[PDB]
From a paper:
Although the ligand-free cryoEM structures of HPM7 spike reveal a 3 RBD-down conformation, our data suggest that the antibody is capable of shifting the equilibrium by capturing RBD in the up conformation. Superposition of the RBD:CC6.30 portion of the model onto the all-down RBD ligand-free structure predicts that clashes would occur between HCDR3 and the RBD and N343 glycan from an adjacent protomer. Although modeling suggests that CC6.33 should be able to bind an up RBD, we did not observe this in our dataset, possibly because of the HPM7 spike design preferentially displaying 3 down-RBDs.
Numbering used by the authors:
A (entry chain A): 14 to 70, 76 to 247, 254 to 296
B (entry chain B): 838 to 887
C (entry chain C): 297 to 618, 632 to 676, 689 to 690
D (entry chain A): 937 to 1034
E (entry chain A), G (entry chain B): 740 to 788
F (entry chain A): 346 to 394
H (entry chain B): 986 to 1034
I (entry chain A): 543 to 618, 632 to 676, 689 to 690
The structure:
């Protein structure tokens, strides 16, 4: 069921800067042509962002377990749909319930169960040289899923699993918070054209979903897909992601004429 | 460090500062005021009202 | 008379008094609720064959329905009913957004723990409400359903835990609790405990030990699109008039007009600088409407002394007069920079000023005066 | 000189600006809760019955009265300063102009 | 207008201390009167044109 | 045994730890109300007389 | 500092009417400015030393 | 929290009144100082120069 | 301390409490001393935050350089947010982020106690 992947190199973690990223619409009220002050958890401006890689070249396939703390800012720069989803929980084994949110390329599945997760979870796509096709071939992630209390499955779709050459073209940003039983997700999708780290700019994320989960989340793990032609027989593709943490902050938000947040001030950044 | 050391002192100035009450300095110092006064006196004695 | 009441006098001397503001009244009311035809699943929530154990409480989403509570009047009887963020009498005029029903069985002496701010084995280890709770807690005796002669042991609660639960947290693990110094790798004796216990529910137990069914309805009000509404009848939408209204439970008075504001898909209401609703998305036609207050002001009264005459002139500061938002006309209408003055004759002769009006204009009482 | 240096008339511009700011402040202050569950009377009345709504409304009324009282007090103080300036101007008209 | 915004229930409660509003307006009216007076003292010194 | 209400008993409690959880596996109370302190704060406090 | 004393819960409640504090400081700042201005008008009349 | 909030709001309102009273008194006193400073400036011009 | 919470700096005290006194209070009736429950030592409590900060700003339409004045810092671990050189000490406080110039000029942005600042030239 589970596979322990090998043949990876050893690099220190990379770091980048968050600039002005991580702002989301704090409410569901239309406002326009106004400055508004709010106090939610936010990614602080110009904060320390940990940079993780999936590269083939110095092979890396970074999918570590990270702390969740008070909430997470997550971002991804991709060309070929490598990052599929996340695991949230505490012990991440069949002692406690945990949340699994995964895009498996045919549907999107959200489950809350006493999952026994793999110690190196992944998904994967096999390339058929014959007739040039990219197909889902593997789903590991867990060995068991007992006592499920929440479940959602999306309508069917077909993901483009083709490997790509070129720069990163898709920036996806998410904010994850766990408050009074709800797992709150905010998101934004921005087109990009970049070759290294998280791009500069400003965009506010919109609410996506409030999930009635009811569990304790202290750690989380990112699920990446593999490419194949086995613990050594694999290709890392190409993709990168960034993780930051939210802290209570006061922000001055600027709403333009059409009610879009176009700018902001982090009131705790400095004396100016 | 002066307000932290001298606690037994019960200094009213520290009590005010710890509660957010601050006294700001004047822009003109006493030395500067004395210079303006001296100029006016020197002027008067030397040239009267002119 | 408004001047006389303000001054607490039956006599008013010569001069100009400000007199409130021009106001208009609403003429009709508008009620706009989403066109929901389904009745809410009261049967499924309150008439269920089985309820969950409190340690593993159930949660169900309620949506796209009418919250007509009266259907329970010919069936259910509740010993406990309390609402926290809304008055009970207002429930039928409102719409609700994320409505969930939590469901479980506890003892009668534990019913008091299902409340914000409580402690005890249920409040601390099985089910907890937030202090900032909007919703209603409903409970009733189920001794004739959940009790058995030899004891109904199918309902469990958590007795042992290392830390307290957070609001709306569920914990269904069965790991052995360590009360002492022993690691408790299994063992389950000495100072090691299985964390859950059963309730011995029997028909002969005293009331404090009889089972109670508890339903908790969690919801949010007036800030987002709603899918569950009370039993109100929608009316037609009336524009460009002063009307009273109710949009998804939010009431007010004002003038509704078409708007050019573009709300994001999740935005139902808009607000101004004073955080007052100034726009809504109509529930049936998804049109954005702007709301303008009915009353806009600008009124003062020019008075000769009342010991001379009772003729007055009224100045409307914001009326152009060139259906004028005035109380009356009756000719003698003169327009100046200070407003539309009604009730005074304009004279082409200049005189010294007596009662100043403003912007170069004065008034006086003169001759048949 | 007057055309060249726009700051020359700052003394008159300041009067205009101060009064405008004071009125805009009163409007902005309407958004304050003052201990109430909501700054909007309609939210209070849409959700609460009379005896509960009354508590929340009294909190807002007291706060709103303080905002107006603060405004009036500041206008009286400023007016006194204007009066002094006007008296100076009147003296100058009599002694410098006539 | 400022306090209640045409809400009837608020207006009826506001009446509990209506002497306050009257007093606020006496103060503002007095200011308005002085502003016209100040203008005349500075400029209308000579009534011969 | 408990005392008659007309001649109610009174006992001094001192030099101990107020761990109320010991009652969870035994007692069941139909009534419980605190007046000068919130129930949730009892475990963080010390008491005098 | 004056009102809450670094208590976090108070600070978060104080924010319900934070426009008030800003207004109090605008008033005090204006006074501070005048005090330096008053000093110059009385003494710095002649800039020739 | 929900009980503490009531008690804290009572203190915040009172603390704000103390600061507002202070500021109002400083503004009144400052006006008196300004008048004295203007007198002094006049004397400098007319008595000293 | 025995259920009474707070934030502050604890130091040894010379206050002598009577046998029945557990807490001491200041003029504002705020606890400013406690008797430790295990070692019967009297400790004084001093608030952590002591103030004195202001910011000197060229217009933001010109530059984003600012200087920060610490009114109660001597600078001669300074209770400042940062240093970065350009540290000048005056009677009005420790000014960090400005170059001291020996030339006198007319005043532009007043700081206090005879000191003014301006934005001048590579400005
Ligand atoms: C959420 O999970 C964490 C991690 O399991 C819990 O924190 C532990 O609590 C035990 C008991 O007090 C301590 O011995 C551990 O040292 C704690 N671990 C960490 C990393 O803090 C936490 O209590 C859980 N939350 C709830 C509400 O139960
Ligand atoms: C991978 O190795 C870890 C020990 O480092 C072990 O816990 C885990 O179960 C192994 N998984 C597989 C599939 O061998
Ligand atoms: C945090 O950012 C700094 C640069 O400001 C960098 O030197 C450092 O390595 C980063 N991360 C950590 C964990 O120190
Ligand atoms: C994705 O998940 C759904 C629901 O569990 C399942 O029916 C489907 O076969 C899965 N697709 C793949 C490629 O594994
Ligand atoms: C390509 O060939 C492989 C091997 O025979 C087969 O499994 C795969 O289904 C084929 N591709 C498509 C699109 O059917
Ligand atoms: C607002 O939207 C309109 C189109 O409806 C567009 O023309 C205008 O430029 C937008 N304004 C801003 C500030 O983006
Ligand atoms: C529960 O079932 C009874 C019939 O046994 C029925 O009369 C009653 O109306 C039902 N209750 C609800 C809420 O539907
Ligand atoms: C959890 O799983 C166990 C079996 O391991 C089962 O007996 C129990 O009923 C399940 N559900 C809950 C809520 O404990
Ligand atoms: C029913 O709801 C739809 C969708 O909101 C709306 O378009 C339609 O006009 C409504 N119906 C009436 C008046 O029957
Ligand atoms: C009233 O409206 C007319 C246009 O119909 C305009 O010329 C006149 O100036 C307006 N009156 C005032 C006092 O502004
Ligand atoms: C126990 O209490 C005594 C008396 O207050 C004290 O002197 C002693 O240090 C305490 N004990 C420890 C740390 O064991
Ligand atoms: C700073 O401390 C020194 C002693 O190290 C003292 O001479 C100097 O006057 C102090 N600075 C100020 C502004 O008081």
């Amino acid at each position: 069921q589970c596979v322990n992947l090998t043949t990876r190199t050893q690099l220190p973690p990379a770091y980048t800067n968050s600039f002005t990223r991580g702002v989301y619409y704090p409410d569901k009220v239309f406002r326009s042509s106004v400055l508004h002050s709010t106090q939610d958890l936010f990614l602080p401006f110009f904060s320390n962002v940990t940079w993780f890689h999936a590269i083939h070249v110095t092979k890396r396939f970074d999918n570590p377990v990270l702390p969740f703390n008070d909430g997470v800012y997550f971002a991804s720069t991709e060309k070929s749909n490598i990052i599929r989803g996340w695991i949230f929980g505490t012990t991440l084994d069949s002692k406690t319930q945990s949340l699994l949110i995964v895009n498996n390329a045919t549907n999107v599945v959200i489950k809350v169960c006493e999952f026994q997760f793999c110690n190196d979870p992944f998904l994967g796509v096999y390339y058929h040289k014959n007739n040039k096709s990219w197909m889902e071939s593997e789903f590991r992630v867990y060995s068991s899923a007992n006592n499920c209390t929440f479940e959602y499955v999306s309508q069917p779709f077909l993901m483009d699993l083709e490997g790509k050459q070129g720069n990163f073209k898709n920036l996806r940003e998410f904010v994850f918070k766990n408050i009074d039983g709800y797992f709150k997700i905010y998101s934004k999708h921005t087109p990009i054209n970049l070759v290294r780290d998280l791009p500069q700019g400003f965009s506010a994320l919109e609410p996506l979903v409030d999930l009635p989960i009811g569990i304790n989340i202290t750690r989380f793990q990112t699920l990446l897909a593999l490419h194949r032609s086995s613990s050594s027989g694999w290709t890392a593709g190409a993709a990168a992601y960034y993780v930051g943490y939210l802290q209570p902050r006061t922000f001055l938000l600027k709403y333009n004429e059409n009610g879009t947040i176009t700018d902001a001030v982090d009131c705790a950044l400095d004396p100016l | 460090g002066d307000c932290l050391g001298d606690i037994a002192a019960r200094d009213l100035i520290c009590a005010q500062k710890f509660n957010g009450l601050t006294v700001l300095p004047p822009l003109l110092t006493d030395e500067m005021i004395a210079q303006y006064t001296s100029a006016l006196l020197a002027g008067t004695i030397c040239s009267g009202w002119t | 008379s408004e001047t006389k009441c303000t001054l607490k006098s039956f006599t008013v001397e010569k001069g100009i008094y400000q007199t409130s503001n021009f106001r208009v009244q609403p003429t009709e009311s508008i009620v706009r609720f989403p066109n929901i035809t389904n009745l809410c699943p009261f049967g499924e929530v309150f008439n269920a064959t089985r309820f969950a154990s409190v340690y593993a409480w159930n949660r169900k989403r309620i949506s796209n329905c009418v919250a007509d509570y009266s259907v329970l009047y010919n069936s259910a009887s509740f010993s406990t009913f309390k609402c926290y963020g809304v008055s009970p009498t207002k429930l039928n005029d409102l719409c609700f957004t994320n409505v969930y029903a939590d469901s479980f069985v506890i003892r009668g002496d534990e019913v008091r723990q299902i409340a914000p701010g409580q402690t005890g084995k249920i409040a601390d280890y099985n089910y907890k409400l937030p202090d900032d709770f909007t919703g209603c807690v409903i409970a009733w005796n189920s001794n004739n359903l959940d009790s058995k002669v030899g004891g109904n042991y199918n309902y469990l609660y958590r007795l042992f835990r290392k830390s307290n639960l957070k609001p709306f947290e569920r914990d269904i693990s069965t790991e052995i609790y360590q009360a002492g110094s022993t690691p408790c790798n299994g063992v389950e004796g000495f100072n090691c405990y299985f964390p859950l216990q059963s309730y011995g529910f029997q028909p002969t137990n005293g009331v404090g030990y009889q089972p109670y069914r508890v339903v908790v309805l969690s919801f949010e009000l007036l800030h987002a699109p709603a899918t569950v509404c009370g039993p109100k009848k929608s009316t037609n939408l009336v524009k460009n008039k002063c009307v009273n209204f109710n949009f998804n439970g939010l009431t007010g008075t004002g003038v509704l007009t078409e708007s050019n504001k573009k709300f994001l898909p999740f935005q139902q209401f808009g607000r101004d600088i004073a955080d007052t609703t100034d726009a809504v998305r109509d529930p049936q036609t998804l049109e954005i409407l702007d709301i303008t207050p009915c009353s806009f002001g600008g009124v003062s009264v020019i008075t000769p002394g009342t010991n001379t005459s009772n003729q007055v002139a009224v100045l409307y500061q914001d009326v152009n007069c060139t259906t004028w938002r005035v109380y009356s006309t009756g000719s003698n209408v003169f327009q100046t920079r200070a407003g539309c003055l009604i009730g005074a004759e304009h004279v082409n002769n200049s005189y010294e000023c007596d009662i100043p009006i403003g912007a170069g204009i004065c008034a006086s009482y003169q001759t048949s005066q | 000189s007057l055309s060249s240096t726009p700051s020359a008339l700052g003394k008159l511009q300041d009067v205009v600006n101060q009064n405008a700011q004071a009125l805009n402040t009163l409007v902005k202050q309407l958004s304050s809760n003052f201990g109430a569950i909501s700054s909007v009377l309609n939210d209070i009345l849409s959700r609460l019955d009379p005896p509960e709504a009354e508590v929340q409304i009294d909190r807002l009324i007291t706060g709103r009265l303080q905002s107006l009282q603060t405004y009036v007090t500041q206008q009286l103080i400023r007016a006194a300063e204007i009066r002094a300036s006007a008296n100076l101007a009147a003296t100058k008209m009599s002694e410098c102009v006539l | 207008m400022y306090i209640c915004g045409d809400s009837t229930e608020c207006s009826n409660l506001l009446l509990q201390y209506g002497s306050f509003c009257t007093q606020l307006n006496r103060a503002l009216t007095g200011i308005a009167v002085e502003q016209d007076k100040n203008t005349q003292e500075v400029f209308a010194q000579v009534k011969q044109i």
